[model samples]
Target: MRELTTVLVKNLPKSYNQNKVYKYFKHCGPIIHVDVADSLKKNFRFARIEFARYDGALAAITKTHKVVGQNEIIVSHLTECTLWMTNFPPSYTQRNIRDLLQDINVVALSIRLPSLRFNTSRRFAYIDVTSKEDARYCVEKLNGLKIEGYTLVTKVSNPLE
Candidate 1:
């Protein structure tokens, strides 16, 4: 499968620092770097692991079972399953969108603030999820969900390339 030089792991314990991450995935391949960071949620940290080769990323993703930790960690690519959604309340911030789509496990988000005058003003966002299934899931799941008196339009559409 196609992959990158990095793989992301979520729901890691605070003790699973950079060194622990290095040791955990070292056997998959040679490691170039590891970064563990805190999330908005408490008592949990996310890890970004980089390998010397893309092959190592593939191996780390496939060969290792997410067997460690109470709630097993989630290992996924840096970004995938992109979704485009619009018609949010113009007042909504990127942080607001992140909270709204928290369940989708969005890995990346890019919001385009609308322009004023001469056209219908609208704010849109490109959101990336862990898998293709989540892409479709968010479409139907969030479709027509009323938020702040505005109906959201979500679909797997064109994103900034």
Candidate 2:
């Protein structure tokens, strides 16, 4: 399958469940998966769906676009896959991590250095790749690798919804 995209939504009713939304979209075709991320105080209420093709996705959106929740959904393609890396030496920069991941089939990508001003130094940094499958592949290959005195913990990033 081609790389699936994510559509970010906002201000949905608090009662929205990922499974119900997935089922609503499944009426058009198969729904590979769906998930929502949120924290105790805030709700992002976003969902990611993998359809067999773009047509199925379009159908779902057209049929259910204005079903009425809170505010309407904000939809867009997720072109980047994000990863969080931590416990590494402070010396680690974007260039070093990019070179380390160059062997993977990532097309367009960017990695940010840990920020000391924001006090995230040595905490975590995000890397965005072009595709989800490529992200999974890179994570599988490097999740346990030791880099700069730290073990890399890589996976598909699902931030707070």
Candidate 3:
């Protein structure tokens, strides 16, 4: 068997579940795994599917690019991973963090700011990057930088953490 290939399906309706996604795609090919990620924002949900064959994944995109549960679903290739970061200035917004990294010669696929319950310099964050090597590069380069009198700490984060 070939290594399973993953696909990211976005903009799914809020009411859709994992079983719905599996049933919709199982006709294309064998699916080894399926994960439906409902956002806290609640406006939309997304799913990640791993197919036993690349052809199945190809067919998924080719076949399921239409509407699903009253919402148009967009499917694409997703290869990026995530990192955990903490000790940012409490005032840091997503753009602030991105700008800080811009100055440090690092960039992320996305950055999620911690909720506003903490001070401006004491919130935790998660950084999404393209690969483990990029995550490590981010950690090694940004971990000891001082921001607002506190040093930044970054590490490769387990998805389960």
Residue 66 of model 1: what lDDT?
Answer: 61
Sort order, TM-score high to low:
3, 2, 1
**Model 3 agreement with the true structure over 46-102: per-residue lDDT tens digits:** 666657466766877886566766888887654446566765555666788668655
Instruction: Report the Cα RMSD per candidate.
Output: 8.9, 13.1, 10.3
**Least accurate 10 contiguous residues by lDDT in model 1:** 106-115
What are the models' TM-scores? 0.43, 0.43, 0.48
Kindly list the per-residue Cα lDDT of model 1 for residues 63-137, writing each as its tens digit. 446656565677766554446677665566657766756656544333333356634566565544444566676
Show the colliding residue pairs in model 2. Answer: 37-161, 38-161, 44-161
Give the range where candidate 3 is weakest over 10 consecutive residues by summed lDDT. Answer: 101-110
For residues 71-120, could you state the per-residue lDDT of candidate 2 as single tens digits?
56644444346666655565666677767666565342445555557554
Clashes of 3: 5
In terms of lDDT, which candidate is strongest? 3
Q: Candidate 3: give the clashing pairs.
A: 89-120, 89-121, 90-120, 90-121, 91-120
Candidate 2 residue 20 Cα shift, in angstroms, is 38
